[PDB]
Amino acid sequence: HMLEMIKSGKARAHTNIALIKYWGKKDEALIIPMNNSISVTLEKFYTETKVTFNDQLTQDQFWLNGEKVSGKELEKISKYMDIVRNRAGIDWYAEIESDNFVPTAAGLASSASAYAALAAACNQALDMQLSDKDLSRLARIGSGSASRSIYGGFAEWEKGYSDETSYAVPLESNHFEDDLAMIFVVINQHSKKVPSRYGMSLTRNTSRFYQYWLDHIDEDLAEAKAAIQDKDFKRLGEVIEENGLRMHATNLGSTPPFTYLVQESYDVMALVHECREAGYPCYFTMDAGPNVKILVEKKNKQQIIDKLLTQFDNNQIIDSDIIATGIEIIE
Amino acid sequence: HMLEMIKSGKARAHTNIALIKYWGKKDEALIIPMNNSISVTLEKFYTETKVTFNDQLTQDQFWLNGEKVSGKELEKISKYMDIVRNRAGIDWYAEIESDNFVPTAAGLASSASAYAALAAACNQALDMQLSDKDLSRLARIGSGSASRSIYGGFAEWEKGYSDETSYAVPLESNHFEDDLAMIFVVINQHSKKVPSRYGMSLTRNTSRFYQYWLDHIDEDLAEAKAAIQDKDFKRLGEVIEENGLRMHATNLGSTPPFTYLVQESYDVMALVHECREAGYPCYFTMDAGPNVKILVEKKNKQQIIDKLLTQFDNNQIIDSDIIATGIEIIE
């Protein structure tokens, strides 16, 4: 009977945002990055994924938010699933049922929560009994950012140099996370975005300013960790802000050059400058798109939102706390 | 009789575009730059200025393209005229009649040609008998880029260290200019631009990435000068292209960050990349606004234009050869 045979599991993983950036791969196939990255795991945003391995199935199936997935997005997950199958030592195809509590039409990325959730769900389903390290490795090979979403709070993706040594590790921050939040200003762009995978490889392999990135990253890593250790908010925010801008500076050197940023991105940056000037510490970062994310202390969260509303619509403004705990299995 | 008494002169100065950039003043009031710059003087674009000093005149008057100028622009030129009066040793007010053959509503800057033509017209009018050096100085203190337009072909603004030592000098290029042209792609952005004077001061004083500019500028000058002496187009083209992109990289680090570039700027850059791939060497540069300028060999000018027209409107595309001779007095 099916209920004797099927192997199944369900997990919930939250998104994380990179404060110290992953930008450029050393190894493209294996998703080994050129540098370590530091992230913060967000409470509001997650993916919940169920996976059901069944011997009778001939293809993987994938549903996202109740809609059957077809095309290259299904092709992509089936490739990932061959890796999970290879690792578990099992040949059964699977039905994947996933729900995103991530506003990705708002251009919020779900890659991070999607493969952490799927890895966690497979680990459950197939009784792989993976450590967090091994679980982070499995998420990493589908999406680099997802390695980090095994953990709550502050996480560091250790680059390593092979499939075995590249994974995320929890950063000790002594509940520093509990005082902080992030504000997202969602921004609509006319032009279709440069896709992140293509975009970072073009820059990493091609940019006349990529050395600038590599020259400063280890400093930024040590500085970020040290401010985290010391619960120094201004010191952390300053590194992360210049870090993200340098990430973006590098795209300007690529052959040919490109930008993730639009004028409205810059308008949010001006408002966060005015906010600091006004006595409210907060710091911006941008990923592979025009949206601006703002690290703030919870004590000033509303003060920052009020200033943003003088310039931006209420529907453009989302916030989240930092969730202190890691990946959850749904029982 | 008025004709016994009045002192008048008329000149034509052409615009110049910087290939190795002026970006950052060491001294604001005196317009001393943080670094040398190398420009090419353009044949198609220019200003013609007549000045008439008259002893009955109680105020300076300024007509541009036959329209009377009032407000801040008149104020600005009367300040400049005060300097010219002081240097000449005369106290007579003047009537300035200027015609721009530069399309400035297209965002092409006339600062370069306007203060050179004015300085040259005053030097005639008042019989200052200024060397090319001292004339370049006089232009410099109204607009920095204008120092360079005393010369045709290739010119270098030597930063010096005072009002006396900061001026432009002609570069020996052995008729390299004659083989070259520039294409302008005019771009209409829908935000108002950051004014250049304010923009370069904010960045010079504030940018997290401005050290990067200064760390690379001397090599870039030496390299550009070397490729000019050697008539090496691709070698010149490569430095001038990276040089301009680094200029823009700097504004990204300012407090708060800004950009001169818009999406359409980037599209022009993608097209010059494709032109190079297709066998047509050309190289792009950008100033304090979104227009893209393309340095090309004349043999390939039409070819780049044809490729630009697959993407851009005919009215967006202006070209110019490099004029080899310097500032002209009229009569």
Side-chain angles (χ1 to χ4, degrees), chain A residues 191 208-209 212 241-242 245-246 248-249 252 255-259 261 263 266 269-270 273 284, chain B residues 191 208-209 212 241-242 245-246 248-249 252 255-259 261 263 266 269-270 273 284:
Chain A
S191 305
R208 346 228 223 324
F209 310 144
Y212 196 44
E241 184 172 289
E242 182 177 336
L245 290 162
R246 193 177 311 107
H248 289 93
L252 200 37
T255 67
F258 69 95
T259 188
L261 282 10
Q263 184 61 42
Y266 296 90
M269 304 181 217
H273 178 82
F284 58 76
Chain B
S191 302
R208 286 152 290 193
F209 307 148
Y212 195 49
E241 188 174 281
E242 184 173 335
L245 290 164
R246 195 185 301 107
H248 293 85
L252 203 24
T255 66
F258 65 99
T259 188
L261 277 11
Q263 180 60 50
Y266 288 99
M269 303 176 216
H273 184 82
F284 59 77

Side-chain angles (χ1 to χ4, degrees), chain A residues 103-231:
Chain A
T104 188
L108 262 61
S110 54
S111 43
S113 58
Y115 284 103
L118 218 211
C122 294
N123 178 52
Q124 198 49 56
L126 303 171
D127 193 59
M128 302 166 89
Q129 291 160 63
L130 300 178
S131 63
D132 283 343
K133 165 187 155 286
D134 283 337
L135 183 63
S136 178
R137 292 177 50 233
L138 220 218
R140 195 253 307 132
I141 196 165
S143 172
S145 62
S147 58
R148 296 185 317 245
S149 282
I150 276 73
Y151 310 98
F154 291 90
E156 181 169 11
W157 180 8
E158 301 188 322
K159 64 204 167 297
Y161 55 85
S162 63
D163 175 68
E164 173 60 33
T165 59
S166 196
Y167 53 88
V169 119
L171 269 197
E172 255 294 331
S173 57
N174 192 219
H175 312 293
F176 188 35
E177 320 74 86
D178 302 338
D179 298 324
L180 316 174
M182 246 181 51
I183 296 158
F184 289 64
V185 182
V186 175
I187 293 158
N188 197 339
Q189 164 180 35
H190 284 136
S191 305
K192 198 200 140 184
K193 231 170 43 184
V194 182
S196 46
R197 171 153 216 146
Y198 171 82
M200 82 166 59
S201 173
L202 180 72
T203 296
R204 189 257 134 147
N205 295 293
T206 257
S207 179
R208 346 228 223 324
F209 310 144
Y210 198 64
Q211 188 65 49
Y212 196 44
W213 176 251
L214 300 172
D215 283 351
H216 290 87
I217 190 68
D218 294 294
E219 245 192 299
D220 288 356
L221 288 162
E223 179 68 358
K225 280 150 148 291
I228 293 168
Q229 284 316 307
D230 207 38
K231 303 194 191 199

